[PDB]
Nucleic acid binder design. Sequence first.
RNA 1: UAUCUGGUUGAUCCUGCCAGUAGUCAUAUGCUUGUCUCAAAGAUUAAGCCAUGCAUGUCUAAGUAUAAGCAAUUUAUACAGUGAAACUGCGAAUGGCUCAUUAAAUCAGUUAUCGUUUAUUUGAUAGUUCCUUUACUACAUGGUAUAACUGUGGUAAUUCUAGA
RNA 2: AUUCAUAAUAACUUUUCGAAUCGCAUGGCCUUGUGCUGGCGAUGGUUCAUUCAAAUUUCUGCCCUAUCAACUUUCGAUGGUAGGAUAGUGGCCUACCAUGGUUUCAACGGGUAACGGGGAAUAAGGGUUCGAUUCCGGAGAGGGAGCCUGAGAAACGGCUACCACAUCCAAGGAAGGCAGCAGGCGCGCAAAUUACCCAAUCCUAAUUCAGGGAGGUAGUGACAAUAAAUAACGAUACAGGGCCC
RNA 3: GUCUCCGUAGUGUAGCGGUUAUCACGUUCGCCUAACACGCGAAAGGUCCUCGGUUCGAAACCGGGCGGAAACACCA
Lengths: 441, 258, 184, 134
Amino acid sequence: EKTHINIVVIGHVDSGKSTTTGHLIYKCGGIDKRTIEKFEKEAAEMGKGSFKYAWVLDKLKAERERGITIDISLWKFETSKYYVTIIDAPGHRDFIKNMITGTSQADCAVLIVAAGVGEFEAGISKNGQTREHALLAYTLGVKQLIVGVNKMDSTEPPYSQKRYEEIVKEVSTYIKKIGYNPDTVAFVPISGWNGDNMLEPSANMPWFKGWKVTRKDGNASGTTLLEALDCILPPTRPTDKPLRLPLQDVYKIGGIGTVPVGRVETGVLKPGMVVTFAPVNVTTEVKSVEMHHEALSEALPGDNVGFNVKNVSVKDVRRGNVAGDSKNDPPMEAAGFTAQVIILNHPGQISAGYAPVLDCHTAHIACKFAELKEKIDRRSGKKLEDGPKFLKSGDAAIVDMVPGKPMCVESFSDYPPLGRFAVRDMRQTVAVGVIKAVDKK
Amino acid sequence: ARGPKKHLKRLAAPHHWLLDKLSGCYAPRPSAGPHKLRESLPLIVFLRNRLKYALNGREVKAILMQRHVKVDGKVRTDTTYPAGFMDVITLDATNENFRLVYDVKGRFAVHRITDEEASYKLGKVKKVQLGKKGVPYVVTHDGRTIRYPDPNIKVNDTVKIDLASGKITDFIKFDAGKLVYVTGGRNLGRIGTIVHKERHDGGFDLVHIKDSLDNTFVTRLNNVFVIGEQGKPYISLPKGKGIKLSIAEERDRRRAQQ
Amino acid sequence: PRAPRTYSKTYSTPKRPYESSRLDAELKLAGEFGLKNKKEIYRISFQLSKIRRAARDLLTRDEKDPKRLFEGNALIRRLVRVGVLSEDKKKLDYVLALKVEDFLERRLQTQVYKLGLAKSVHHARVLITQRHIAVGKQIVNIPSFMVRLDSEKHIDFAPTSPFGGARPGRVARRNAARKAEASG
Amino acid sequence: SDAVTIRTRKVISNPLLARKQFVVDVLHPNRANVSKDELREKLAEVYKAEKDAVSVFGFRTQFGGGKSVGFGLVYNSVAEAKKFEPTYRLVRYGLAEKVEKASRQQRKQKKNRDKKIFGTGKRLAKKVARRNAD
RNA sequence: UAUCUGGUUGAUCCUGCCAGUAGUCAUAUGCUUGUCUCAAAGAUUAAGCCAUGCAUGUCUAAGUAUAAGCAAUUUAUACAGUGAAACUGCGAAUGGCUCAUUAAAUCAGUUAUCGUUUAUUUGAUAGUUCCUUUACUACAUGGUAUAACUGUGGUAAUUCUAGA
RNA sequence: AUUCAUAAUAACUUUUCGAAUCGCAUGGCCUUGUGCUGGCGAUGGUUCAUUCAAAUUUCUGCCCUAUCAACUUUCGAUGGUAGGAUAGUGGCCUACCAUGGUUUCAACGGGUAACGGGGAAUAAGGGUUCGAUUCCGGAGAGGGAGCCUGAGAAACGGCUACCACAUCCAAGGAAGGCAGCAGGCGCGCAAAUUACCCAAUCCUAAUUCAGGGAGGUAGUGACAAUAAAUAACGAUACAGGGCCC
RNA sequence: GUCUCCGUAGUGUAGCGGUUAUCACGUUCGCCUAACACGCGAAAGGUCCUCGGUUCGAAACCGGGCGGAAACACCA
């Protein structure tokens, strides 16, 4: 046998992300009955009985008390076709950077959409996250995705049809403007809390015939969400390139040294291999590697593997570095880089010195635009003007920008997953771009 | 330490074994037997480093297991058998009988004896007692117990054990004018004649043994071994016969040989 | 738990390391005998101190002393063997009158110069280290060999050396092949 | 390879081990070394034996080149060679085949795992399978 | 290789100390680093705490097998060839690591056991044990299980164990 | 030097040992029979001696302190008698009796960045300092106590209990002591691979075969030591040292 | 990693969305000697941590980033 893929999940607040995620993990051999029954008892004492499924991924004390997904969390389950692990996105404008960290380490995406009356209109609004989360997915390199219409029982009439057809029509109009073809995307009606149309075909809604997709590789037609998870295409894994794994976390595991963990964006990580973290500049050797409490020999691209360093420290190591083999061309600090970025509406004007929190890959940092080289056409890199005076919404441009804080970045031609980024300012996605050139240190 | 020790590092082994200090950190500790570990020679070192017949440890084991050597009539099969003074190893193959006799320098030798000489072994008795049922017995240096001995046999004499039958055939009394063999001490391996002795009834009896070259030395009675009368040795003496030449005389001997 | 190996330092640093008179003396000796490090002079002086100390301890003992005689002739025989002491100076008193130059003369570097195969002591050093010179039937590449008046007649070019016949050599072949191909 | 001139030294006889030991001195002028199969081949006819009856080890080439000193053994019979020559040298030339007993690590783990069960384990295997079938 | 020097004073001779000098199986660190041989290496503060994987098990010609294990006996009708597991007999008190405790204590040289134990070895060493000892009793020879194993199983777990 | 070894008397034992074990080759006598004799061995066994040991013990010797001068004996201290216990001598313990024993010739008490020694650095000699660390003799398995088995343990890679730690829990319960080999955290100026092999040196078992992180090999390694590359040699342009014209 | 308290010349550190300044120390400058010294006579010294908005207008209104000052977390 079975392949390995990686999914992330996204959506508006109270759309039922963690409820749909956790209950789907329960159905597909995630945890036994006494573990989730314990979670029902503890959450009933807290007062949040509905969040018992959401608790499975939301393990922190602040998350369970508030009933809010603050930071991302990992959990695996084996489908009929292959292995897969989920990224539980926050779904808040407060924690939008944590979503960007999670979606950047994801191949596919499960866009959870609320079906209940009033909640869908709030989700796809100016202030809502349904517009933002779908836009941020295509920005970071999630080419293929799936949309899931949640809370069919809550909506009126429950498990009806029209309401479902209205949501699919409303999403299809918006999702074309982002870039995703809604013909290739599958639309599945589900209920996360009830457990309807996720594993087995639903009894409450016989009206639903079945979703369908029309790709170049192969067509698929499934009844449930689980079959739609099987129909996701195997991504292109660049195994031959130099390693470029931006670290995720660095743990100090009991009786086995320091253990750096991160997805192999490019290359093949293995035990007994020296690595260099980019911004801090710390060289160290890995003791061993693991993925969801299971050891590995070869950490292939797109994997939740986690090396472990040695002969150094947990502080020398850090979330954000690139273990480019100390033997191969390692990741270096970027003083200034040529990174085009197109913008998605900055309320203020974008001139110079403007340092938005560039969230290239898993790292967010303020970057000040040294200047604007050329005003460029919206596509094909066509040069329109030489040396602009200012820039506005709905316009492309190449721009050289200096970070206000030590950051590691790389060109799009060398590393496609590394080269993607977005821009944020005034609590909104002001611009989106890709880096073509970069000056090393 | 909570019991006996079965190990011997290759730094506390007796120096007369002529073992190196680089081939392993351990030494072939002799098993319990007729002689003490510090006054005997294991069969492994004798066949590997003295006769050079065997190279490795397993070669000695293979030779021993094949029923070839015969120590004191008995074939024996232990690689760490403590063969000491007055021990004769008989080899059916190669037609050689080897006798363990100390040299002048302070080690063992490879003295070859005829088949007739290997039929008898000299033994210095240590204790004479009246055992159970009133039977007298003697305790030789090798620990052999011989019942019903000659009444004239007393402490500190030497008997001629028949080996094949284990019976006493001749006894040599300890008195002045007796050729002896020093076994143990800084004066070991010397052969000379007894002139007199101071009794010293407090322990450690001393005897003044005189060499054939008018050289006299003092050795405790526990380290002596009478091997015959004056001028007639009951055993074939090793080469040199314990002249004990000085460092000057040895150097001239080498320069007269090269 | 194996028996440790024995190591010893073969040189003694001077107590006064900062003195013009001694500094120029070793520079003259090193240049004349072709020595790179002055530790080589430190080494050869250390051996001189040891034998002088041993010989001095012998001279405080009476004549016809077995210890003095045996070690005395053994040290004298070794010195006359290696060639630092002449045959008529075997009296245990000239041993204390040995100098560093006498020991330095016995080095194989100086003997190669003396027999006339290097034309310069520095060229003897490169000949020593490039394996073009052998002792007897053995190639020696150590400058300090201390021939002992018996192998001095056996000092000759090694059979496996381009200078003494044999295969012509490396840079010669590259030049020979280059000119042969140019002329062909 | 040229003017090998295999000269033997310190030859001894052991009817105890049915072998003759000798420090073999081999000179290799203008040639690097002599392969082990090379000395064994001409060791056969000097001692009037076969190729598969001799054993040589060592052969540390003398510094400078042109000389090598090693220690050699000759065995009278093939069966005597099997029963006396160690296994590592047997598999070395052509005499036997070294079967891989996995390695030391897995053998130790298997021994400990077999030590954790008291008996053959056939009844234990069927009992745990029946109990843990569901 | 039994060696000194600089510094109190305007200047001198002393006492006197500081500093310089060289070495360290005395370490730590810095800069640099091409080769051959040999080779120390979690002692100093923490004898502070440990994930995980190993570190002692074992048979011959010769203690016990019908593996309902494996080849072939054809010299073998009871096996008698090889032989897991188990019972049994030994070993596991050796080795390895550390220097916490301890200042006539340990330990070193040196005595005694005529004041004791001693597996394993080595050399020797039980004509006398049927007790109204003539029927009281097999002595070309006695009795009793039990493990492995077959099957029933229990606990979430253990080198966990029961009943037949 | 013995009430020593040993022998014999009169008894004591609920009674120790005095072969119901095993492998090969199977041979001789004839009163011609599963009749009677018969070898080379292994295992075990009571006692003695010997050996590998173990445990006590004679004499001498250990750092700094008197801003430690008296210590020990309540409830063991010194010695004697007798008895228990020990494998043995013995206040080792008990009952009684006597009041002794040590000390300025440095007792006793305190500190020790104190296991001791063989040894290491340093020097003419004298000596000073260090010595956990490859060898020998000791102590410990986190701090103590107790015990089975076995010749031998007061054993911890054997158990039992308590305290301080700490692991798995479907909350009843169960499993542990890396100052063993690697490796992890902490500590600090300060110290290596979670590798390979029983090929060597040995040890153990029933035993030639098997096992051994004992050990060896490799890797990290500028702790310390040995030797030793990085350059030499001709001809040309100058500048010389004796000397020839 | 999440959450909270502060950030202001050189040291001090005030002070207050239509506007950043003060105070001592200091920092220099004319002062004398020979260099001084005290004695003195005068003036050089802040993107209000960074970015982005709110903004007629902000450092202060708000939010993001960093720095420091405090917490709780962090079994591939």
